[PDB]
Each structure stands twice: as structure tokens, then as C-alpha cells.
Amino acid sequence: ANPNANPNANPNANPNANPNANPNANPNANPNANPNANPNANPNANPNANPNANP
């Protein structure tokens, strides 16, 4: 049989797909996640804050 990729296929998005949220997903916290401090963030982190005494 043909072992190569098929170039004659639909290259566009499928509108006939389920548009709703999936109830069959893992509802639990992920234990396999980066536990470290992520040395990539805005180090000048004064971007925008309330300048008044109260929120």
C-alpha cells in the first residue's frame, strides 16, 4: 500500500466538530508540572496598580 503522506486531503478546519466543553477530562491537579521558579518573567514588575489607598 502507499506508505507516504496523502497530499490530497482537506487542508481546512472542520466546522463539524463538537463545540462544547469536554466533561471527560482529568479534574485533578497535575503532579507532573514544573516545580521551579521560572527564570523568565517581567523583572521590572511594576506594570499597573491602584494608586489609591483602597481598592
Epitope: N2, P3, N4, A5
Partner: nanobody, 121 residues
Amino acid sequence: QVQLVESGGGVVPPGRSLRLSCATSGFTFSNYGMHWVRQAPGKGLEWVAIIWYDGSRNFYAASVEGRFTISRDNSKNTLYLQMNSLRVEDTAVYYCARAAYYDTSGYGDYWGQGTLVTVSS
């Protein structure tokens, strides 16, 4: 230009394993299936294995099935051949070929350089 470069050969005593490789360049690796072909010294060519473009389907020759394993890594453009329980009759030059399909049968348009595997004691 299509470039297939192979490595991983050498000398190995019978009964144990060896792994070959075939690094590719000059084409989209994830779009094509690949073949392994070997040639015993002074003999003709012999087909060994094929792998699909996505790695779903593998086919092996009758004399190497159960022992050889073919796999690919699409993120490194590399084709592997894991050769286990090597015997004396497995001494040959191994080539990697790019799969092509014409009408009702397949062929290989581009071939590698070949690497020599010798099994001896």
C-alpha cells in the same frame, strides 16, 4: 538535494544486539515512508523492513521478523534499525531507501550510502 547518511555499523559477536541509523536532509522527513535493504557480499539485494510515515504500520521480512525493529524520530529526521540476536547470516551491507509508490507497486527513488555489519567470532 536528498541526502541520506548512515552510521552505526561495526563488528559484533553473534547472539547480541546492534543499532543502525540513517540521518536525512533535504526533504520533509515526516511525509515519507522508509525502507531497509541489505546485500550479502557477492549476492543480490534483499528487502528487510518498511515503516509508514507516521510510524503506525511496520512490516518485516520473514527471515528477520521478531528480531529486528524499525522506528523513526520525526523531530530529528532519523531512521533507526534495532537489530537483536544477531546471527552469522546477518552479515551484509545495509541501505536506507526512501519509499515511493507508482501505480500498484512501490520503489525507492533515493538511497543511502550503506553501512557494513559483520557478525563473526
